[PDB]
Amino acid sequence: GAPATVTEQGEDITSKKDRGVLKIVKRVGNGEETPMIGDKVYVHYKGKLSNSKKFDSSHDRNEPFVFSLGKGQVIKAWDIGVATMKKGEIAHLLIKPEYAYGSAGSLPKIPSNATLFFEIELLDFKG
Ligand SMILES: O=C1[C@@H]2CCC[C@H]([C@@H](CO)CN1Cc1ccccn1)N2S(=O)(=O)c1cc(Cl)cc(Cl)c1
């Protein structure tokens, strides 16, 4: 399935090159620009655990998720991954716990030492 593919075929997008965040582009976005620190970013996403459980989805809420890029409002892998995305891009991320919730997890939804899969669609961003 998709998590397998990004695990096996994804690009390491970390600056450390520690394979902690892997990415594949599912839909190529529009224009070369990518969001920058402080930008208000609007996305749709779905997140799955390594047992296939879908732990969250913005689509299921009929409204996007909004955050300010690069400010630590989200897990590290999102600040890193979303910074790579073009407007309209759909990407998959496969994230080791060091770039997500670590050994603590985030109860009740995210267990300890959880590798996370996301599909993210970047709808828009603005300074
Ligand atoms: O950094 C996050 C990441 C990535 C952005 C989308 C969501 C938001 C919105 O739920 C939560 N956060 C930030 C955050 C804030 C507070 C506690 C834990 N995490 N998540 S998430 O992994 O899908 C998530 C979804 C849900 Cl329902 C619960 C948790 Cl603990 C985490």
Strands, helices and their partners?
Layout: H1 2-9, E1 11-12, E2 21-27, E3 40-48, E4 54-57, E5 65-68, H2 76-82, E6 90-95, E7 116-126
Antiparallel strand pairs: 1-2, 2-6, 3-4, 3-5, 3-7, 6-7
Bound molecules: the ligand O=C1[C@@H]2CCC[C@H]([C@@H](CO)CN1Cc1ccccn1)N2S(=O)(=O)c1cc(Cl)cc(Cl)c1.
Residues 47, 56, 65, 74-75, 78, 106, 109-110 line the site of the ligand O=C1[C@@H]2CCC[C@H]([C@@H](CO)CN1Cc1ccccn1)N2S(=O)(=O)c1cc(Cl)cc(Cl)c1.
Short description:
The PDB classes it as isomerase. The protein is mainly beta and 127 residues long.
Amino-to-carboxy terminus distance: 36 Å
Based on CA atoms alone, the radius of gyration comes out at 14 Å
> What is the number of strand segments?
7
Count of domain modules? 1
Shape descriptor reads globular
Bound molecules: the ligand O=C1[C@@H]2CCC[C@H]([C@@H](CO)CN1Cc1ccccn1)N2S(=O)(=O)c1cc(Cl)cc(Cl)c1
Main pleated-sheet profile: 7 strands, antiparallel
Encode the helix/strand succession as letters: HEEEEEHEE
Structural class: mainly beta
Give the count of helical stretches. Answer: 2
The share of residues in helices is: 10-25%
- Strand composition percent: 25-35%
